[PDB]
Design a protein around this ligand. Structure first.
Ligand SMILES: CCS(=O)(=O)N1CCC(NC(=O)c2n[nH]cc2NC(=O)c2c(F)ccc(C3CCN(C(=O)CC(=O)OC)CC3)c2F)CC1
Length: 298
């Protein structure tokens, strides 16, 4: 890659990292804009260039705006609108009190709007976690750091938290589905919904098999009765232990029956019965949705 394209930006602090990139807060010297940068070290793929170009076109109020794509030296920089906090820090700050139900409902509604938008363009997020959800003082929440169909970049050696990505993975992914669907995003968001309500991760596995078994112990070991074709999936084993399902009233107390009903549809095993983002927006849980503002300490 050529030189000098990033001289317009002044990095002000390192604010995060992930499998394939380091995140900075930065300022444009020309415009004064404050921005987030994702720095990807390269060893390029044109298919990935086109995927990122399409994401730059996918603009919605509940998707973090991708402002620019800049290649320089052995690096790819993605330039994003800046948001001051992510949902993980907000739940951590709210751990003693919990997030008020109206704000949980607003955040879930907004994220379903962003996903219904993406999914209508046949775009998957693939990597939805609390740290991918950015919030501002006005009460908005936004989807960030979409995963691509094929990754690229030199893995960041200083990043040690990839185990946390298991927690939000859909069972069809864990069972070896190669061409999974927008339903994986609904699963992840369901896990995040339960986490907002209970102030505890729903399925905090630490290996692919522990992740599957944690799902099975709560929702029951899946079989042909509830998921036709599951026993033929590439990583399905007849030797899986057979656990009975638990009740959702144990799983996310004290959530009301509207919320529990919606959560149960977001956590259906079969990606063909799992509720879509659009159908979820019509769920009776949202009959009284409002837009509260969070108390953010920046
Ligand atoms: C105390 C902190 S904070 O809450 O004060 N606050 C400080 C401000 C900060 N703002 C921004 O970052 C930001 N603003 N506009 C756009 C932004 N970022 C991104 O687009 C972006 C990105 F380009 C790449 C990766 C990530 C995330 C994805 C999820 N992650 C992982 O998968 C790795 C991991 O550990 O998984 C468990 C964590 C990193 C991004 F968000 C949020 C957190």
């Amino acid at each position: 890659g050529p030189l000098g394209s990033m001289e317009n930006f002044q990095k002000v602090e390192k604010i995060g990292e992930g499998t394939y990139g380091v995140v900075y807060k930065a300022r444009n010297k020309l415009t004064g804009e404050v921005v987030a940068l994702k720095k990807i070290r390269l060893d390029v793929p044109s298919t990935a260039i086109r995927e990122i170009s399409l994401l730059k076109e996918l603009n919605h109020p509940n998707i973090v705006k991708l402002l620019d794509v800049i290649h320089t030296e052995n690096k790819l920089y993605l330039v994003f609108e800046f948001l001051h906090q992510d949902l993980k820090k907000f739940m951590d700050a709210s751990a003693l009190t919990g997030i008020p139900l109206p704000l949980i409902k607003s955040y879930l509604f907004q994220l379903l709007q962003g996903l219904a938008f993406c999914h209508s363009h046949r775009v998957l997020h693939r990597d939805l976690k609390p740290q991918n959800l950015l919030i501002n003082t006005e009460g908005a929440i936004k989807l960030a750091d979409f995963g691509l169909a094929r990754a690229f970049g030199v893995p960041v050696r200083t990043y040690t938290h990839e185990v946390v990505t298991l927690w939000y993975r859909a069972p069809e992914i864990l069972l070896g589905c190669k061409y999974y669907s927008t339903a994986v995003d609904i699963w992840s968001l369901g896990c995040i919904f339960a986490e907002m309500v209970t102030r505890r991760a729903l399925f905090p596995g630490d290996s692919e098999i522990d992740q599957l078994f944690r799902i099975f112990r709560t929702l029951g070991t899946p079989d042909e009765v509830v998921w036709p074709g599951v026993t033929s999936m590439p990583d399905y084993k007849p030797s899986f232990p057979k656990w009975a399902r638990q009740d959702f009233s144990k799983v996310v107390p004290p959530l009301d029956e509207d919320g529990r009903s919606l959560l149960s549809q977001m956590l259906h095993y079969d990606p063909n019965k799992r509720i879509s983002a659009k159908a979820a927006l019509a769920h009776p849980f949202f009959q009284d949705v409002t837009k509260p503002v969070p108390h953010l300490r920046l």
